[PDB]
Design a protein around this motif. Structure first.
Motif, PDB file in Angstrom:
ATOM      1  N   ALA B  39      88.768 -19.575  63.241  1.00 44.36           N
ATOM      2  CA  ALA B  39      89.529 -19.194  62.057  1.00 44.36           C
ATOM      3  C   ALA B  39      89.353 -20.227  60.953  1.00 44.36           C
ATOM      4  N   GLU B  40      89.413 -21.509  61.309  1.00 45.16           N
ATOM      5  CA  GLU B  40      89.135 -22.554  60.333  1.00 45.16           C
ATOM      6  C   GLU B  40      87.699 -22.462  59.839  1.00 45.16           C
ATOM      7  N   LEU B  41      86.782 -22.042  60.710  1.00 38.78           N
ATOM      8  CA  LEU B  41      85.412 -21.782  60.282  1.00 38.78           C
ATOM      9  C   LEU B  41      85.367 -20.647  59.269  1.00 38.78           C
ATOM     10  N   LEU B  42      86.168 -19.607  59.494  1.00 37.21           N
ATOM     11  CA  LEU B  42      86.209 -18.476  58.578  1.00 37.21           C
ATOM     12  C   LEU B  42      86.823 -18.879  57.249  1.00 37.21           C
ATOM     13  N   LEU B  43      87.688 -19.885  57.262  1.00 34.58           N
ATOM     14  CA  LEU B  43      88.262 -20.373  56.020  1.00 34.58           C
ATOM     15  C   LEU B  43      87.421 -21.471  55.385  1.00 34.58           C
ATOM     16  N   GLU B  44      86.406 -21.973  56.090  1.00 32.65           N
ATOM     17  CA  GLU B  44      85.413 -22.815  55.434  1.00 32.65           C
ATOM     18  C   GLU B  44      84.698 -22.041  54.340  1.00 32.65           C
ATOM     19  N   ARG B  45      84.487 -20.748  54.560  1.00 31.45           N
ATOM     20  CA  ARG B  45      83.904 -19.846  53.581  1.00 31.45           C
ATOM     21  C   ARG B  45      84.987 -19.189  52.736  1.00 31.45           C
ATOM     22  N   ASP B  46      86.210 -19.715  52.812  1.00 33.90           N
ATOM     23  CA  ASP B  46      87.360 -19.266  52.032  1.00 33.90           C
ATOM     24  C   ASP B  46      87.618 -17.771  52.246  1.00 33.90           C
ATOM     25  N   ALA B  47      88.037 -17.466  53.470  1.00 31.58           N
ATOM     26  CA  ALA B  47      88.376 -16.100  53.830  1.00 31.58           C
ATOM     27  C   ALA B  47      89.627 -15.655  53.082  1.00 31.58           C
ATOM     28  N   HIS B  48      89.683 -14.369  52.753  1.00 36.28           N
ATOM     29  CA  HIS B  48      90.859 -13.818  52.096  1.00 36.28           C
ATOM     30  C   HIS B  48      91.590 -12.924  53.085  1.00 36.28           C
TER      31      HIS B  48
END
Lengths: 284, 295, 287
Positions: B39-48
């Motif tokens: 999930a933090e990986l997905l927010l590395e790409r700034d997930a919405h």
């Protein structure tokens, strides 16, 4: 960049005792207010009151600024603003929870008002229960004087390149003093919580308790009239510290004219000002 | 849930608009299967987080169905969806109440909650919370400020539903809070009527204590007695009669509680009701059922 | 019902280096001002500026107020008012020897000025010699627009039964903060600074050193337009303490209407501000 200003304040609807932010007026070209029936009136010139400007200078002299914030959602802006408030001892640390709960409620729009059945002012409390404020609930004079296809019309009136500016004002009982927050994002971001036709660039927050010589609606109107000016918003784009903003506010207030109560015929009194205002605007 | 594989995929810039035919998002399987290091990986790409498929569902709605709350508690600062409804207009509040996790009320309390939002039926999260009427709900719902009894399209107030399921706890909590004891539906049914149709003597006694009228009539003349007789619940009918319920009330169709008990061949009921009832107001088959929220 | 208000400042003459008092404007229901020529401009409505009213409020919150004092001359007034400024510790006692001669100076009108040659602004010092101000100055707005027969019309407009007010404004470098004195006489008095035969009842003293956002001419204009209003004048005629004047001042400011500078000014959109001023008028006359 051109600007589009929107003012919102804390209210509460009648069917359920639930506080929410409601818009009150817009500043595309002139101040256009929203009546109790939910219909917008006529555009007209922006006149203020002296207490509004006095308290705006006083609270902006000791206000809190946040320049080039790197955010994309309202929750992050709220958290950073609250932390910066705690840093300068504006509010007590035990009030952080209440303000963070307050600033994250849902933001309705003009379409839902007839579904709500009417809304009334709602001041916050430490326990979070809504109540009626201990202040005279007389309505605004502009509502008394200016109310008693529009989306596409304003969309045609919207300039194609513009960055919006949201001002949020209200009253909260458990605080001890009015507090100011002026936040400018680094790049324009589309906040998902509030639906504004153009992205948000600036953000004003003025909140506090019930105090003498203070009306929060007129103070917000004064803030909107500040944000609608060319040179002040140019200095806000060129701003890098609080000193430049205070200097620009001094320069803005240096070029106003105040009208005392006169028994003259009102049209002749109003028409005598025109070349004085022209010379002042040339000087500014 | 191989995380370094997803780290390898991240530099290749795989899109986060990867959408199946069922409407799932990459966040949905992380919410389901509890593989959350990515999930933090997905927010590395700034997930919405705001992402709704064909069924209009959000990462919170899929997360609450199988709760791994450690992600959601951190998603809430990461631009979480505060009042996101499903395609059924369902807020996370009442579906979290029906799922009934121990900290999900505290999870939303970290941000706040609205327990009065209208669904496509018109039902509020308060009403669906009261329908299940769990033990911690009657404590926690107090912190939230909402209309204590809120009608739906049917006009069903939380008390009504509690009487339908006969949950004494919730019925208490609600009366104590100050809900309307004899709240009526659009047709005119009260929580007594409904409890009598259910036949729950407990769900009727409690209401009697709450002072809901024992002779509350419907818009068609049906009273909690007529209802207990049509249901065949002699227990409830006897409890009503003993508590002053009138047995000689003719409905809009001319059938009294005795007439009904008879037509339904319920004898145990007919013995008490027919004698308690006076002679039928008229010489002579429409029944009477209380409203209920649709699927 | 209708009163006469005079405003004089302490400036210097182009003839010889000196200090003396010269009037700058007059108020009978309207503002009349004169330029360098010695000619009085056409009367017009008085327009306020933000700093004038604001600093008037600030200095008025800490002003000594003397009500119904029994004097008829100017020297006894000077003595008593300077004793009052000594009394409430508004000024140091080592300044009085200057300020007395600051007050006992000539008060000439426009007709003397052509032989004098014209005047220019000057500042009091501790010594007693005129001096040029340190902070920069700008051309006045009312004299540029309005200045760039009359006394018969002045005596015609003024009813024969009336009393007058005077304000004396000046800059003095040997002070700390601006000071204000407000004295209402016991009885009407004739004073030798005013050539008009009307007597005087009220009197203002506005002094101070030089500070930013303060223009003493504008402050005097604020004081005069404060004195000209009917209700505040009636309150001062019936005033018995300071808090009454404070409440009347707050009522004055509350019914004021301020308009900001804009981008493109116009008359047609401005005509919609008629009724709100009328309602402020009504709410002002509500009191």
């Amino acid at each position: 960049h051109k600007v589009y200003v929107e003012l919102q304040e804390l209210v509460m609807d009648e069917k359920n005792q639930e506080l929410r932010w409601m818009e009150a007026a817009r500043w595309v070209q002139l101040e256009e207010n929203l009546g109790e029936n939910g219909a917008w009136g006529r555009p007209h010139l922006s006149h203020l009151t002296f207490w509004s400007l006095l308290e705006l200078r006083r609270v902006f002299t000791k206000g809190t600024v946040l320049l080039d914030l790197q955010e994309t959602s309202l929750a992050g802006v709220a958290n950073q603003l609250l932390d910066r408030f705690i840093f300068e001892d504006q509010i007590r640390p035990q009030d952080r929870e209440e303000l963070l709960r307050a600033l994250l409620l849902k933001h309705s729009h003009a379409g839902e008002l007839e579904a709500l059945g009417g809304v009334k002012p709602a001041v916050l409390t430490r326990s979070g229960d809504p109540s009626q404020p201990l202040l005279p609930q007389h309505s605004s004079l502009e509502t008394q004087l200016f109310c008693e296809h529009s989306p596409s019309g304003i969309l045609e009136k919207i300039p194609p390149d513009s960055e919006a500016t949201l001002v949020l004002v209200g009253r909260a009982d458990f605080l001890e003093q009015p507090v100011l927050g002026f936040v400018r994002l680094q790049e324009a971001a589309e906040l998902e919580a509030v639906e504004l036709p153009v992205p948000i660039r600036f953000l004003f927050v003025l909140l506090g308790p019930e105090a003498p010589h203070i009306d929060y609606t007129q103070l917000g109107r004064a803030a909107a009239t500040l944000m609608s000016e060319r040179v002040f918003r140019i200095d806000a784009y060129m701003a890098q510290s609080r000193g430049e903003l205070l200097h620009s506010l001094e320069g803005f207030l240096d070029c106003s004219l105040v009208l005392p109560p006169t028994d003259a015929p009102s049209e002749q009194a109003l028409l005598s000002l025109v070349p004085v205002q022209r010379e002042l605007l040339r000087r500014r | 849930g191989h995380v370094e594989t997803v780290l390898a995929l991240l530099e290749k810039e795989a899109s986060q608009a990867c959408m199946t035919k069922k409407g799932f998002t990459p966040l949905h399987v992380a919410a389901k299967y509890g593989k959350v290091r990515v999930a933090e990986l997905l927010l590395e790409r700034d997930a919405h987080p705001n992402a709704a498929g064909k069924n209009g569902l959000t990462p919170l709605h899929v997360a609450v169905h199988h709760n791994n709350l450690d992600i959601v508690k951190l998603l809430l600062p990461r631009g979480g969806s505060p009042h996101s409804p499903a395609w059924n207009g369902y807020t996370p509040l009442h579906i979290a109440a029906k799922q009934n996790q121990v900290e999900v009320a505290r999870s939303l309390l970290q941000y706040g909650g609205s327990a009065n939002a209208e669904s496509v039926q018109g039902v509020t999260p308060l009403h669906l919370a009261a329908q299940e009427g769990h033990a911690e709900m009657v404590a926690l719902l107090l912190s939230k400020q909402a209309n204590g009894n809120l009608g739906n399209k049917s006009g069903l107030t939380p008390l009504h539903l509690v009487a339908q399921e006969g949950h004494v706890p919730v019925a208490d909590v609600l009366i104590k809070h100050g809900v309307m004891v004899d709240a009526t539906t659009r047709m005119g049914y009260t929580p007594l009527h409904v409890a009598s149709h259910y036949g729950n003597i407990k769900l009727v006694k409690f209401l009697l204590q709450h002072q809901a009228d024992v002779n509350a009539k419907t818009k068609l003349g049906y009273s909690p007695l007529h209802q207990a007789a049509q249901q065949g619940h002699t227990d409830i009918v006897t409890l009503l009669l003993k508590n002053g319920a009138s047995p000689n009330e003719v409905s809009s169709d001319g059938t009294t509680p005795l007439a009904i008990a008879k037509r339904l061949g319920y004898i145990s009921v007919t013995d008490v009701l027919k004698v308690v009832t006076d002679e039928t107001s008229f010489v002579l088959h429409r029944m009477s059922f209380p409203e209920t929220v649709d699927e």
